[PDB]
Each structure stands twice: as structure tokens, then as C-alpha cells.
Ligand binder design. Structure first.
Ligand SMILES: COc1ccc(-n2cc(C(=O)O)c(=O)n(Cc3cccc(C(F)(F)F)c3C)c2=O)cc1
Ligand SMILES: *[C@@H]1O[C@H](CO)[C@@H](O[C@@H]2O[C@H](CO)[C@@H](O)[C@H](O)[C@H]2NC(C)=O)[C@H](O)[C@H]1NC(C)=O
Ligand SMILES: *[C@@H]1O[C@H](CO)[C@@H](O)[C@H](O)[C@H]1NC(C)=O
Ligand SMILES: [Zn+2]
Ligand SMILES: [Zn+2]
Length: 215
């Protein structure tokens, strides 16, 4: 998160920190959010050979009683996900067991808010602590320069006149508008110039229910 502020610890208790394993590289990291006690929603580009979810985190370098490190048994990447266009950048992770509900862990033109442990700058490292930024929902033409952006599939997020933005490592986290999840951090420019592209959750809600009901 570029241009945001540190959250009050555990103020966003649905937030999931994902450590993703690949066979041919070191670990990578994403966000996500707990939608059921045993399901986390994130972006498809966060898929890997294996994933661990950490719930209840604030300072992700300092283990604490709020932490629940949970095994992911199966990854449900959208079957039409496209690794070029990044259409359909949405994935469900089924957790091995249902999480514990605690104070720190629970399920989940206008201004919206996005939170994550991503980089605080193009050349800056990932944040130790959960950061949040408020971003403006843009008219789709503000994202035209992303040639494979589609207004029906995706939100266009963040005023190009501000430097505020999600960035690397914030992938898969929720954009909330008036307290409801509406987007998932998907992609943007390498220079972090807004706006960025978020998956439009509403479009995927039939697919989400299908997965939940079958698992
Ligand atoms: C399908 O078309 C695309 C076009 C762009 C990329 N691409 C490319 C980058 C690069 O080239 O380094 C890059 O850093 N990022 C990260 C990035 C940048 C800006 C904002 C964000 C976000 F807001 F999403 F968090 C993110 C994740 C990136 O998404 C991925 C596919
Ligand atoms: C997050 O927690 C870590 C503890 O692991 C903090 O890291 C310490 O930070 C100070 C600088 O403020 C260093 O001098 C210490 O060496 C660090 N300790 C360790 C174990 O690495 C970090 O400051 C915390 N971040 C917050 C709360 O913003
Ligand atoms: C992904 O999108 C590209 C460009 O529109 C298309 O040519 C390609 O076949 C797609 N890949 C799959 C199999 O989804
Ligand atoms: Zn916050
Ligand atoms: Zn704590």
C-alpha cells in the first residue's frame, strides 16, 4: 500500500496473509480475505504449488496469540482465468480446518478502501504491518490504457492525480466500499501510477457460490 496509514492492529479481522510456494522460485506473498471459516478469497495470480494462510496478523514479522497459520488443502482458481489478460483474476482457497472466530479473526465516484502488507513504494520493501488506503472508484475510461480492462469484469480504482494505490504484495486483498467487499486487487502499472485494476466481485458471485456449495 502506497500512501496509506498503519491500521489499528486487528481492526480488519477478515484479512489474510498468503505465503505462496512455487517449485522453481522462493516464496511470494499476497493478501486475501476470509469469507467463510474455511474459505479465503484472493486473486488467481496468487496461485502456487502450495499456500499457507496467516489469519489474525498485524505485524507479520512478530508471531502472537492472534495468529492462526492455516494449511490450504485445495486451490480453486477461476477456470477461465487468463495469464495474459488477467481476466477472471479470482481464486478460492479451501482451508484444511475451519478457523477459530476471535476478536482478531472473523469472516467478511464513491470512495473505497483497500488494505495489505504490500510494498509502500516502487523501490520499497513489503510492509511489516497492515496498511490501509482510501481510493476513488473511477469511470472505466480512466483505465482504458490497460488494453484488456473490461468494465463489466473489473473496477477502475484510484485517482490518477494522487499517488495513493495498492501495489506489489497487495494482490488478492479486498477493496471495501461502505463496509462491503466489491473488488480484489489484481494489477496495475510497474511505476504505481493510478488507477489500478481490481476484479469486480459481483460478476463472480455465482461462481463463488457454486464452489462453496460443492466443497
Ligand atoms: C494483465 O496485464 C498486466 C499489466 C500489468 C501487470 N503488472 C506489471 C507489473 C510490472 O511490470 O512490474 C507490476 O508491478 N504489477 C504490480 C502492480 C502494479 C500496480 C498496482 C498493483 C495493484 F494495485 F494491483 F496492487 C499491482 C499488483 C502488475 O500488476 C500485470 C498484468
Ligand atoms: C514489527 O515487529 C518487529 C519485531 O520482529 C520489529 O522489528 C524490530 O524493529 C526495531 C526497529 O524499530 C529493530 O531495531 C529491531 O531489531 C527489530 N527486531 C526484530 C526481531 O527484527 C518492527 O519494528 C515491528 N514493526 C512495527 C511495529 O512497525
Ligand atoms: C488468453 O487471452 C488471449 C488474448 O485474448 C488468448 O489469445 C488466449 O488464447 C487466452 N488463453 C486462454 C487459454 O485462456
Ligand atoms: Zn485500517
Ligand atoms: Zn495483536
Amino acid at each position: 500500500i502506497i500512501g496509506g496509514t498503519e491500521c489499528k492492529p486487528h481492526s480488519r479481522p477478515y484479512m489474510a496473509y498468503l505465503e505462496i510456494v512455487t517449485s522453481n522460485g522462493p516464496s511470494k506473498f499476497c493478501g486475501g480475505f476470509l469469507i467463510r471459516r474455511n474459505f479465503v478469497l484472493t486473486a488467481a495470480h496468487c496461485a502456487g504449488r502450495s499456500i499457507t494462510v496467516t489469519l489474525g496478523a498485524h505485524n507479520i514479522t512478530e508471531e502472537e496469540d492472534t495468529w492462526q497459520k492455516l494449511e490450504v488443502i485445495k486451490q480453486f482458481r477461476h477456470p477461465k482465468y487468463n495469464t495474459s489478460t488477467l481476466h477472471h483474476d479470482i481464486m478460492l482457497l479451501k482451508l484444511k480446518e475451519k478457523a477459530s472466530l476471535t476478536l482478531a479473526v472473523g469472516t467478511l465516484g464513491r470512495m473505497c478502501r483497500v488494505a495489505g502488507w504490500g510494498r509502500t513504494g516502487v523501490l520499497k520493501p513489503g510492509s511489516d504491518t497492515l496498511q490501509e488506503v482510501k481510493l476513488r472508484l473511477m469511470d472505466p475510461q480512466a483505465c482504458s490504457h490497460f488494453r484488456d480492462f473490461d468494465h463489466n469484469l473489473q473496477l477502475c480504482v484510484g485517482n490518477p492525480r494522487k499517488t495513493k494505490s495498492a501495489f506489489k504484495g497487495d494482490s488478492g486483498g479486498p477493496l471495501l466500499c461502505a463496509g462491503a467487499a466489491q473488488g480484489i486487487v489484481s494489477y496495475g502499472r510497474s511505476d504505481a501510477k493510478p488507477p489500478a485494476v481490481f476484479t469486480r466481485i459481483s460478476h463472480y458471485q455465482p461462481w463463488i457460490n457454486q464452489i462453496l456449495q460443492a466443497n
